[PDB]
Amino acid sequence: LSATILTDHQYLERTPLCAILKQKAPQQYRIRAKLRSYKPRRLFQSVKLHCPKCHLLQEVPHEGDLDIIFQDGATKTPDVKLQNTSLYDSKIWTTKNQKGRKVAVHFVKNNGILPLSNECLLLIEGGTLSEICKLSNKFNSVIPVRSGHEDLELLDLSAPFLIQGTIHHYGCKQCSSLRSIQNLNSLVDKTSWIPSSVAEALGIVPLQYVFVMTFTLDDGTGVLEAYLMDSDKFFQIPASEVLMDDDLQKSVDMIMDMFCPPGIKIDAYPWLECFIKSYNVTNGTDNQICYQIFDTTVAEDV
Ligand SMILES: [Zn+2]
């Protein structure tokens, strides 16, 4: 009974960990070990934001953090000058049982024609998080913007650059070169918006949700630490949706408890067979070899 299986390179035979620790990097192996321990055991913390370029890892903002970022609004009132362009028709909200500077909403055109409420992109100006949450509940896509000087500009990259219902898309604060909002006119399709096109139209390098864990693997032959950076292949659970779904995180809780069950000794632990790759690092004056799991998924059990 193996807990994980290989999704590729199955022709490979198993290599014991004693051999791997003695060898060079980079190389790839097939192993079969037991999960002695894992970090972080707080699985709410294992979900991070990853940039495919700078390779940074940052935490996912809590609703409290997102509250403070949005509550500030910006440095000025929404410039009435920047309304009803050749890109969006605008409606200004009030402070009338509503809060903020002045909540302005800009419905980007479907190239001349306004959309309905079912497939429309919204630019909201100086809105609190609660106002953004209600509007993202009614419309498909929402972007937090702010009045700059010559054009609307994104609020801040610490806030999501695109909100589609309950999914929050973030960008890299160091690899991105923010373009002003008018560049959204270069979008081909103006009825459906995916984050890749929106981010590039705005010069944003989109972050990716990832599980980040360090498995301590032991086959009795030796002990090895393997990194897991995964979207949705390993656990077969989307990391972009696990942080907000009580069942998703529970079934991930249950997979870790299956690999490394508390109160149980290592004999009853199930075998994890994985495909790992080694790579070099200049860890101090010496030389470390780190290991990462690839092409490995959990076996058939929910
Ligand atoms: Zn980056």
Tally of individual helices: 6
How is the main sheet built? Answer: 5 strands, mixed, barrel
**Number of folding domains?**
2
What compounds are bound to the protein? zinc ion
- From the spread of the alpha carbons, the general shape counts as elongated
- Helices and strands, in order, run as EHEEEHEEEHEEEEHEEHHEEE
Strand ordering within the main sheet: 2-12-13-15-14
Structural class: alpha+beta
How many runs of DSSP E, i.e. beta strands?
16
Strand content: 25-35%
C-alpha termini separation: 15 Å
Organism: Homo sapiens
Family: Belongs to the telombin family.
Subcellular location: Nucleus; Chromosome, Telomere
Protein name: Protection of telomeres protein 1
Task: Give an account of the 3D structure.
- The protein is built from six helices and 16 strands.
- With 302 residues, the protein is an alpha+beta fold.
- The protein folds into two domains: 1-61 and 206-302, no CATH class; 62-205, no CATH class.
- Zinc ion (ZN) is lined by residues 51, 53-54, 56, 172, 174-175, 205.
Provide a compact summary of the structure:
Helix content is about 15%, strand content about 30%.
Task: Note the topology.
Layout: E1 4-6, H1 17-22, E2 28-39, E3 47-50, E4 57-59, H2 63-71, E5 88-92, E6 104-108, E7 121-125, H3 129-138, E8 141-147, E9 152-154, E10 162-164, E11 167-169, H4 195-201, E12 208-218, E13 223-230, H5 239-242, H6 246-259, E14 272-281, E15 288-294, E16 296-298
This protein binds zinc ion.
Task: Throw out a few tags for this protein.
monomer, 302 residues, alpha+beta, 2 domains, five-stranded mixed β-barrel, five-stranded mixed sheet, 17% helix, elongated, binds zinc ion, Protection of telomeres protein 1, dna binding protein, POT1, telomere
